[PDB]
Amino acid sequence: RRDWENPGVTQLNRLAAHPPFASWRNSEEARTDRPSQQLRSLNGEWRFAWFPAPEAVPESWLECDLPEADTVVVPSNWQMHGYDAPIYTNVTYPITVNPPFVPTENPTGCYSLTFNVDESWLQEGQTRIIFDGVNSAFHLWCNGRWVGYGQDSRLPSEFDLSAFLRAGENRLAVMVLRWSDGSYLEDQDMWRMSGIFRDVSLLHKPTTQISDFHVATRFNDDFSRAVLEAEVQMCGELRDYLRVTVSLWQGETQVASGTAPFGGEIIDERGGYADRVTLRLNVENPKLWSAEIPNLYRAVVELHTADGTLIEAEACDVGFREVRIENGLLLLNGKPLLIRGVNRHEHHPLHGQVMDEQTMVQDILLMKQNNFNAVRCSHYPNHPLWYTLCDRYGLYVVDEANIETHGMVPMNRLTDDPRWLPAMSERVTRMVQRDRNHPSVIIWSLGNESGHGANHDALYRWIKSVDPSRPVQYEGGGADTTATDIICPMYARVDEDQPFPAVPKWSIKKWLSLPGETRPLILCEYAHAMGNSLGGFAKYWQAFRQYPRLQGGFVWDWVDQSLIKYDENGNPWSAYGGDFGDTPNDRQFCMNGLVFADRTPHPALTEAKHQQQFFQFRLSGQTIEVTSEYLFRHSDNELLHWMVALDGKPLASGEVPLDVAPQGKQLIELPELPQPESAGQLWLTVRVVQPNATAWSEAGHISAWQQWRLAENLSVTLPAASHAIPHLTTSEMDFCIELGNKRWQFNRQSGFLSQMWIGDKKQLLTPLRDQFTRAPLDNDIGVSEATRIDPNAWVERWKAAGHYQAEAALLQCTADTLADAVLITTAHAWQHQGKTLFISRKTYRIDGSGQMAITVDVEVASDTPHPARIGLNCQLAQVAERVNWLGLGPQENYPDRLTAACFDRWDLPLSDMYTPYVFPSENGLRCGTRELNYGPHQWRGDFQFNISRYSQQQLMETSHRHLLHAEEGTWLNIDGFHMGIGGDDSWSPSVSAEFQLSAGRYHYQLVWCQK
Amino acid sequence: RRDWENPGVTQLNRLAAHPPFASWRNSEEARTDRPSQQLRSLNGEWRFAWFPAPEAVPESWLECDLPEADTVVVPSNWQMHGYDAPIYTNVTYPITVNPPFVPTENPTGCYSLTFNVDESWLQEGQTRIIFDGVNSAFHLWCNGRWVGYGQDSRLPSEFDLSAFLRAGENRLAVMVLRWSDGSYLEDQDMWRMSGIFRDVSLLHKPTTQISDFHVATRFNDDFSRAVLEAEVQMCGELRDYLRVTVSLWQGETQVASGTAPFGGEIIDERGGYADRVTLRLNVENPKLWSAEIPNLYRAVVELHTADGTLIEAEACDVGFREVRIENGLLLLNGKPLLIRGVNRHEHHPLHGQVMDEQTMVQDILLMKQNNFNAVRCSHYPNHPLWYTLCDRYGLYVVDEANIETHGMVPMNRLTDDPRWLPAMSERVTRMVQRDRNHPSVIIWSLGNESGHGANHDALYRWIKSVDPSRPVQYEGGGADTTATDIICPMYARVDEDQPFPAVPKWSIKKWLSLPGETRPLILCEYAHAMGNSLGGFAKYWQAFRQYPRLQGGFVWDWVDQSLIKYDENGNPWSAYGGDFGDTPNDRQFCMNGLVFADRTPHPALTEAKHQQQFFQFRLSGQTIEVTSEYLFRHSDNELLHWMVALDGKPLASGEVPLDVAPQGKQLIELPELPQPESAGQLWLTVRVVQPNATAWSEAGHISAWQQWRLAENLSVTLPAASHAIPHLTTSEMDFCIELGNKRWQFNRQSGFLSQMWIGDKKQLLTPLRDQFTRAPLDNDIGVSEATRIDPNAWVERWKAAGHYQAEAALLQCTADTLADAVLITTAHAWQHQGKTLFISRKTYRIDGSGQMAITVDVEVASDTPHPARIGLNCQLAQVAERVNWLGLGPQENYPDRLTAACFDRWDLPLSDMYTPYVFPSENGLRCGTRELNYGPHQWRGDFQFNISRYSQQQLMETSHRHLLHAEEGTWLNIDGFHMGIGGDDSWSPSVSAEFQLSAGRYHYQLVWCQK
């Protein structure tokens, strides 16, 4: 019997799912969550062996471990230890598509462990083992005797060893298989790893047990009186003297309690459950749970005798909140939620999908500090400690069943087949039974991207029938089917319609106005942050804040899924798909997160933080209108810090405390702002600073900022008459301008600024030319390979039009000396296969004061695709440690993503100017720059600049950031106009028409001088 | 691996369910449903062996059959061959309640068969075997090699033997198990039998096959244009030249056709089913299917090449009808249905649950001739030929999944457990996939009486999702849950409320008026016809006809489930529970049907026929208002036959043809009715006679009748003065009255009529006394045993009050001779433990003409339970072949069930006076009797009489009808007043207060004379 090639069998001798168990023998130990000696952790040093097929495993392994077997740690994935190559794939399966059969060459991992068992465990009670996660299917042996079989990978597998364990030395043999019939429901977008990647533990229970416990909460309209209903189940013998006490505690103070003998209310015609008891606990003025104030209660259930002797005590964390939908609005505690969620994948920086507490808490801190209040357990149930930490820290959780069939044709091939209904039934109902007692879990989910079948909606309202206290959503079928209470499309744009056949992704504003539609809309996946991405986030959040039924969304995703490889010298470097020999693979589509693998924040995280602030600001005259977006908390740990700056120079500042009601409005009256007579721009910047340190933030954390533009003083002064006039010399091939120490050189053959001389030091390695092309971004490439070309991609449109191949042709190049200047006129044209794409006419004015002025006027054809850039390109010959610029910053920004950047004077090292994207592309651009200083050079005007040690060409050719090499000198690209980056999705052109360089005629001015 | 003790496994290597297959290789053979040579029937002589446990089976049986094995026929149940004792139980399980474990002593039946296979079947294509039904679980071997495992009992099990069959002699080994984990879902109310009780067949298909075909019909509001949507699936290789033609035929004429190459519409984001094709056939003016006019079409699907070479053709019967619910009304073809259904169990008269075509057609004929238009496949899917015959003859079918958990505590113990969801999922979805193409199937059902769990409603709207064309109902949970579209209670009374805790059975009129209720009400089980039962059917059908949302119900049930046993001399006799040594057992609760085991109609079937007529009559003056209840047919095969009778003597008669529109109204004007001057009553009787013979009725069949009461002539004449006066002689202990040839004798010690003499012949064996007690009926006993007493039962109330034990005490007995009479006065009292229950005072008047008059005046206490009878008891000494009576008849009737009986002069043999109920009770009563003639005796007055050869006492003591012995002479019980029998249920007092003898004082007169 090949049980891994049969969907009809998913378990053998497996115990039922339940909330998580510790088997305390003392109520005080259960109350404070001290560790229980009845619960042993089997994580540690295990014996591992690898085989290319399950049939290749010798039967001598069942008796004793092989001498050739190595020793690994548990939990771990054997792919990271060299036994196999991990495969990543987005859509196509890593195996042949022939369900339910897997290929014969099935990688097999044989785990072995020897240990000791106390004799008190064998004398009484039941001893069970828990496998929190095994990818994918496994067979279990105890002392050479077969125990059971498991199939699910993200839910615990429990087996009984009471009749199998022996006193003294005991050996457990586990045969893990990489592929199984359940792997056809595991087509999620991650590195396809395998092994025992979660905790293994032993649990001991008495003869009469606590089988399961359900916790539910019921409120009134004012949320001042709450009823705590506790359903209690037992396994074992039925005696009259067994009693149950459910006690609620806040800190060390008991709130409510109740004792009832076993026996339930009459449900049907001849009685009810005799092994189930009901407890109704009354709480007066409870502290409601929320993402802002995570108020928690400790409920300790205990199974004891009428004399008071305790048999077993179980505890859980209880949060008093309700999630319900009326009038098409998702309400939590009576208030409409605004979800600031983000998709999260279990990806350890070093251990693959082996998840620990440290990285969990670091993730929660980084998410809460960046104004995220929700998380989507995508696309699988998570490690149960994650939900506990979400209770402790206050994050909303969307629990999702581990179901994805993205590789069938069509999408609903398996999900409409009734033969696969038992598999997804045991994959949904067990997770519902496990994580139903967590108040952080507020929305259930059936899975991601599996089409619409009858089994899906059947499970959806099975969850509605069993757990009515939580809404449940589903994507597949067009996000408008009967299997969802919340409209949840993938990457639906704010305004532009994309009508695909039979699954149309309408714009969310138009979607909510569809005939007969009433459900609220929360995006399960939107704003693809793949590399240099996340443009138009401001449009999404303006739509969310304007519309009452637009309740936010989940950004895909949090962390890049990149694995660490080593070079010939042992230096680590992040790797993506195809770097391990796996074929096929979607090449870098595993890096879509807002942070790196080592939890280093991307520049997009700052924009995501700014667009999700809980405080909104409006400047009217001299008053500031502060609007709070908090739903349940009062502003008690915030103060408003304003500052008025004239061109980066501070003039006035101060601190005002904040007192705003939840969803309230407060007026701040600023003192008399200073009125300067000097030229410049007055910028008013306000910040909300938290003085005290919370459980997720440190003292001085900034949560919101906003900056405006005050009264301006335009410069009407005139430069002084320079006593020295520039000397112009005409050569047969060259134009040279002298000012004494300063010398410029223009090449008449190329028509560009050839060289510049300060004393005897040359300043440029390549001549100052134009640049209408950037390194292609991840959103810019799309899903196009070298083998398969996508004509809709921007980069393919540019290289088909010859933007990357056009050669500059010199049309005119004249020089003439003026009264207090030397004037240079040039005019070029870029032609590809006889078609003129761009025409630029420059005017270099060399003043006697030393400043040299560049006026660029560019004509762009529109039949060719719109250029990504209109600007200048040069390579400086001097490498400076510090770079000064006055403008938006200090982080990387773009024309569609600049709302988070602040206009000020910024000083940064040159290494911080280049952000280290794993796939090299256009990066480091800073918009709204009025002045730029680098070494002895100063640039003034209105431009977008980026500065690095790497040329654009090297960023195009090189595919790994570790293969990039610093070039001689310093590369600089000053751009008068830049095209937005998009970010709605990474497979279609997502750049809005307002951010495309499509005017046709462009003009910008530059001033070059030495400071 | 014990697969029969595991709910997680229900099948191994079992093919998917589908509509029924024949694998024709010619479209003409498929069109007319000729037998296909590709489909072989394996029914015949099989080798059988019995074992007390599966572990006791030797492994030599896998190679060759045992020499000690006997030879039985297939399909058959081994319980009927003496290998085991069949167990019947209503509620309690036949095994211990410990799911999913069955007892170790598991009866096992090993079936073996040797046969030959043509070599053409092995060279190409796939050969599969079909097991239409095996009770309960079985393991299959082919040529000593294990093939698969099955668990379901009422759905086909299909396995592949293409890699297992060999040329020449082949042996199939089947090991059937009586109990399995699936048997916990088989707690239906039948004799728990076991074996291969349905057909076994071999089917051969090509390499490229027709996997499944869905047929759906869509109409407009006027039902004049219909769209035929055919979904076609394939298994095998995908080639471009495969084409599908769906052809619709009416008789030999083609109606519509369509040819399309394989490939479906785009359903999801990257395409649709490439192995599925869609055909839309347009039909102009289709003939709609209904229970009245079963118009059928033959749809032949064929899989052929583009050149026209046919590979495989499959055919099915298609009926153009729609079932839908709007405004709380169940509509078929736009008209509100009035269901006249009846519950039916697969119970063969001789072979248990081995069902053949002959008894199926006989059942359909008997049901249609008795005005039944629907059947409930209770509580399991049926043999697929039954649905085909329901299409052919026109019966509505309510298909029910084989699920019942009546033995758990509580009822929803398993159905709310998610671990059992795969089992009932494969038990529901497979039956949906199998019987979805039958137009007779109009309502789906989840099962019967299993409480309310989440899995139930999950499957309910799984059926809604997969098959929206049919409503689906469910009982459990109080018949008001979210798992049903039709309110379907068990045995809910018309008016009286029975509020059980948490599952209340409200009266249907009050139920429909509940707040927030909108669904229509169709009783899934009502009017328990257990033995002498079915009282108050007129009230039920008056409620059905008066209320628009009361759409009828299903009578439980059709046929008694009684097994044939043999006595010491070999005479067959029907037996009930406990007669085979089975313990426990509900003693005769398996006989609830309207017909006997041999399809002999009960007297209740006549009442069920009369209350379900499609023609309603109303007499106003001299006109007759005929109202048709047909929804789609015109009255073209009916004529109205009226007859006017004066005290059984016909005066005028004639025939009028009927011309009534469907749900129409017609006026019949009767000629001048005769006006007699003679005393008597004028009764007008009308009958609807079908002149032509339909497919279900013979020429002259009567479908409806109704009889009224016309003008009366009261008798004012006086008897002539008798010349002879009766002589009265007074003795010390006796009163003797002489009239010459006639002599009467009254015993002064007992106070009763001692003897009567005609010439020298004695006429009575026991003296004429009172009788206030009847033999207890099945509804009267209830659920009370000798071990367990139910104080609410009528018989227990009577025997606790001493009604069966009261002794008559003589109070007064006086005699006096009148001028032309001799007057006898007596007065008695029945006392039990010092409490007087009944007091009767009679007045015997002996006239000189020969008639003797009896006037009875009875005082009844009301603190004692109301008596079942107030009348006279005597045993005649003469046995007459013929009995004449003028009154209601000729069938058995009762005070609550007399609407079907007709007032006329009836002549019947004495053997037809006693109906042969298997459990003896009160039977043969005829109400409304004005004159009764038996031998030389004549009784006149107003009384209810029954006459038999068996005393009431013998009917009480004897429990089997075959143990009854004819007593000497003839027993006669004349009753002035009789108590109704009830019939709403057989476990609670169902007698209405208007049919209970509760007035307190009763009077009736009798006239005894010799004709």
Of A501, A582, A508, A498, the residue nearest A539 (C-alpha): A508
| Cβ pair B2, B9 in contact under 8 A | no
For B724, the token pair is 């002879």
Residue B149: strand pairing partners: B12, B139
Distance between CA atoms of residues A942 and A934, nearest Å: 16
Q: What's the sign of the alpha-carbon dihedral B59, B61, B64, B66?
A: positive
Could you check whether the bond before residue A726 is cis, i.e. omega within 30 degrees of 0?
no
Q: What's the sign of the alpha-carbon dihedral B791, B796, B800, B801?
A: positive
DSSP of B155-211:
S-EEEE-TTT--SEEEEEEEEEES--GGGGGB--SSEE--B--S-EEEEEE-SSEEE
Distance between CA atoms of residues A733 and B334, nearest Å: 96
430-489 in B: which are within 8 Å (CB) of A? 430, 433, 451-452, 454-455, 457-459, 461-462, 465-466, 476-477, 482
Close Cβ partners of A718 (under 8 Å, ≥ 6 residues apart): none
CB atoms within 10 A of CB A236: 18
DSSP of A910-964:
SGGGS---SS--S---EEEEEEEEETTEEEEEEEEEEEESS-HHHHHH--SGGG-
Q: How many CA atoms lie within 13 A of A896 on its CB side?
A: 25
For B27, the token pair is 């479209």
> Can you say how many angstroms the Cα of residue A117 is from the centroid of all Cα atoms in its chain?
43
Close Cβ partners of A819 (under 8 Å, ≥ 6 residues apart): A725
For A125, the token pair is 């009670």
Q: How many CA atoms lie within 13 A of A417 on its CB side?
A: 23
DSSP of A209-254:
EEEEEEEEEE--SSSSEEEEEEEEEEES---TTEEEEEEEEETTEE
DSSP of A265-304:
---BTTB--SSEEEEEEEEES--BB-SSSB--EEEEEEEE
| Cβ pair A433, A463 in contact under 8 A | no
As a three-state string, the secondary structure of A805-833 is CCEEEEEEEEEEECCCEEEEEEEEEEEEC
> Can you say how many angstroms the Cα of residue B452 is from the centroid of all Cα atoms in its chain?
26
Q: How many CA atoms lie within 13 A of B58 on its CB side?
A: 10
Q: Is residue B375 helix, strand or coil?
A: strand
Q: Look at A8 and B11 and tell me if their CB atoms are within 8 Å.
A: yes
| Cβ pair A822, A726 in contact under 8 A | yes
Close Cβ partners of A669 (under 8 Å, ≥ 6 residues apart): A622, A623
CB-based burial label for A543 (10 Å; 0-12, 13-18, 19+): middle
DSSP of B602-616:
PHHHHHHHHTT-SEE
Three-point CA angle B753, B759, B761, nearest 5°:
65
Maximal C-alpha separation, chain A: 113
Q: Look at A269 and B503 and tell me if their CB atoms are within 8 Å.
A: yes
Distance between CA atoms of residues B641 and B655, nearest Å: 4
Question: What does DSSP say about strands A44-51 and A70-74: parallel, antiparallel, or unpaired?
Answer: antiparallel
Three-point CA angle B899, B922, B372, nearest 5°:
40
Question: What does DSSP say about strands A869-876 and A970-978: parallel, antiparallel, or unpaired?
Answer: antiparallel
Q: How many residues does chain A have?
A: 1011
As a three-state string, the secondary structure of A378-422 is CCCCCCHHHHHHHHHHCCEEEEECCCECCCCCCCCCCCCCHHHHH
**Of A10, A409, A457, which has the smallest distance from its Cβ to B465's Cβ?**
A457
For A482, the token pair is 């009967």
Q: How many CA atoms lie within 13 A of A372 on its CB side?
A: 28
CB atoms within 10 A of CB B955: 23
| Cβ pair B368, B703 in contact under 8 A | no
Q: Does B429 touch chain A (CB under 8 A)?
A: yes
Q: Look at A503 and B269 and tell me if their CB atoms are within 8 Å.
A: yes
Gapped junctions in chain B, after residues (C–N > 2.5 Å): none
Of A312, A389, A311, A305, the residue nearest A344 (C-alpha): A389
B713: left (phi over 0), alpha (psi -120 to 50) or beta: beta
Provide, as residue numbers in chain B, all residues whose Cβ is less than 8 Å from the Cβ of A274.
Answer: 409
Distance between CA atoms of residues B164 and B524, nearest Å: 46
Q: Is residue B424 helix, strand or coil?
A: helix
**Of B12, B274, B459, which has the smallest distance from its Cβ to A409's Cβ?**
B274
> Measured between alpha carbons, how far is residue B955 from residues A17, B563, B774, B971 in Å?
58, 21, 9, 12
Question: What does DSSP say about strands B297-305 and B310-318: parallel, antiparallel, or unpaired?
Answer: antiparallel
Nearest CA in chain A to B412: A268
What is the side-by-side order of every strand in the sheet holding A639-646?
A: A649-657, A639-646, A680-690, A701-713
Residue in the structure block whose two tokens are 């046709």: A1000
Nearest CA in chain B to A482: B465
Q: Is residue A591 helix, strand or coil?
A: coil
CA distance B460 to chain A (A): 9
> Measured between alpha carbons, how far is residue B778 from residues A799, B328, B589, B956 in Å?
93, 37, 9, 11
Distance between CA atoms of residues B75 and B113, nearest Å: 13
Could you check whether the bond before residue B290 is cis, i.e. omega within 30 degrees of 0?
no
> Can you say how many angstroms the Cα of residue A435 is from the centroid of all Cα atoms in its chain?
23
Instruction: Provide the annotated binding site of B for Mg(2+).
Output: 404, 406, 449, 585
Q: Is residue B78 helix, strand or coil?
A: helix
Give phi and psi for B213, each to the nearest 5. Answer: -140, 130
Distance between CA atoms of residues B237 and A454, nearest Å: 27
CA distance B314 to chain A (A): 22
CB atoms within 10 A of CB B45: 9
DSSP of A512-555:
HTSTT--S-EEEEEES---SS---SHHHHHHHHHH-SSEEEEEE
Q: Which of A525, A629, A796, A892 is catalytic?
A: A525
DSSP of B793-822:
SHHHHHHHHTTTT-EEEEEEEEEEE-SSEE
Distance between CA atoms of residues B511 and B508, nearest Å: 5
For B911, the token pair is 């053997």
Distance between CA atoms of residues B420 and A785, nearest Å: 49
Looking at residue B912, the DSSP 8-state letter turns out to be G
Q: How many residues does chain B have?
A: 1011
What stretches of B310-420 show up as alpha helix (H) in DSSP? Answer: 357-369, 384-393
Q: What is the dihedral of CA A944, A948, A952, A954, to 10 degrees?
A: -170
B214: left (phi over 0), alpha (psi -120 to 50) or beta: beta
Helix (H) or strand (E) holding B457: helix B454-466
CB atoms within 10 A of CB B359: 18
Q: What is the dihedral of CA B503, B507, B509, B515, to 10 degrees?
A: -30
Looking at residue A78, the DSSP 8-state letter turns out to be G
Give phi and psi for A388, each to the nearest 5. Answer: -65, -40
Close Cβ partners of B395 (under 8 Å, ≥ 6 residues apart): B291, B364, B367, B368, B372, B373, B374, B375, B440
Radius of gyration of chain A (CA): 33
A987 is in an annotated binding site: yes
Distance between CA atoms of residues B994 and B535, nearest Å: 12
Helix axes B454-466 and B421-434, enclosed angle (nearest 10): 30
Interface test with A, best of B1, B268, B426 (most A CBs within 10 A): B268
CB-based burial label for B601 (10 Å; 0-12, 13-18, 19+): middle
Helix axes A454-466 and B454-466, enclosed angle (nearest 10): 150
| Cβ pair B667, B623 in contact under 8 A | yes
Residue A864: strand pairing partners: none
> Measured between alpha carbons, how far is residue A655 from residues A661, A708, A904, B429 in Å?
19, 18, 19, 69
Q: How many CA atoms lie within 13 A of B405 on its CB side?
A: 28
Of A228, A239, A245, A231, the residue nearest A302 (C-alpha): A245
Give phi and psi for A647, each to the nearest 5. Answer: 55, 50
Distance between CA atoms of residues A98 and A92, nearest Å: 13
Three-point CA angle B305, B306, B311, nearest 5°:
10
Could you check whether the bond before residue B440 is cis, i.e. omega within 30 degrees of 0?
no
Distance between CA atoms of residues A937 and A949, nearest Å: 17
**Of B419, B466, B482, which has the smallest distance from its Cβ to A454's Cβ?**
B466
Looking at residue A357, the DSSP 8-state letter turns out to be H
Distance between CA atoms of residues B359 and B564, nearest Å: 17
Maximal C-alpha separation, chain B: 113
Identity of residue B173: A
> Measured between alpha carbons, how far is residue A917 from residues A532, A555, B560 in Å?
8, 19, 81
Distance between CA atoms of residues B210 and B301, nearest Å: 9
For the annotated catalytic residues of B, the residue numbers are 449, 525
Of A977, A727, A1011, A986, the residue nearest A871 (C-alpha): A977
Residue in the structure block whose two tokens are 């008894």: B359
Interface test with A, best of B92, B147, B269 (most A CBs within 10 A): B269
Helix (H) or strand (E) holding A465: helix A454-466
CB-based burial label for A324 (10 Å; 0-12, 13-18, 19+): middle
Residue B310: strand pairing partners: B304
Nearest CA in chain B to A479: B268
Q: Which of A449, A607, A638, A922 is catalytic?
A: A449
Inter-chain contacts counted by CB atoms under 8 A, chains A and B: 124
Of A82, A41, A56, the residue nearest A177 (C-alpha): A56
Question: What does DSSP say about strands A734-738 and A727-730: parallel, antiparallel, or unpaired?
Answer: antiparallel
A598: left (phi over 0), alpha (psi -120 to 50) or beta: alpha
CA distance B149 to chain A (A): 12
Gapped junctions in chain A, after residues (C–N > 2.5 Å): none
Of A813, A684, A681, the residue nearest A747 (C-alpha): A813
Residue A323: strand pairing partners: A332
Q: How many CA atoms lie within 13 A of A449 on its CB side?
A: 20
| Cβ pair B652, B644 in contact under 8 A | yes
Q: Is A957 a catalytic residue?
A: no
**Of A11, A270, A502, which has the smallest distance from its Cβ to B8's Cβ?**
A11
Q: Is residue A896 helix, strand or coil?
A: coil
Of A392, A404, A390, A388, the residue nearest A342 (C-alpha): A390
386-425 in A: which are within 8 Å (CB) of B? 409-413, 418-419, 421-422, 425
Distance between CA atoms of residues B685 and A446, nearest Å: 67
Identity of residue B198: R
Nearest CA in chain B to A481: B465
Helix axes A421-434 and B421-434, enclosed angle (nearest 10): 150
Residue A685: strand pairing partners: A643, A707
> Can you say how many angstroms the Cα of residue B927 is from the centroid of all Cα atoms in its chain?
25
Q: What is the dihedral of CA A97, A100, A101, A102, to 10 degrees?
A: 70
Close Cβ partners of B802 (under 8 Å, ≥ 6 residues apart): B832, B833, B835, B837
Provide, as residue numbers in chain B, all residues whose Cβ is less than 8 Å from the Cβ of A419.
Answer: 16
Domain boundaries of chain A, sorted by first residue: 1-206, 207-321, 322-612, 613-718, 719-1011
CA distance A158 to chain B (A): 14
Of A128, A105, A81, the residue nearest A177 (C-alpha): A105
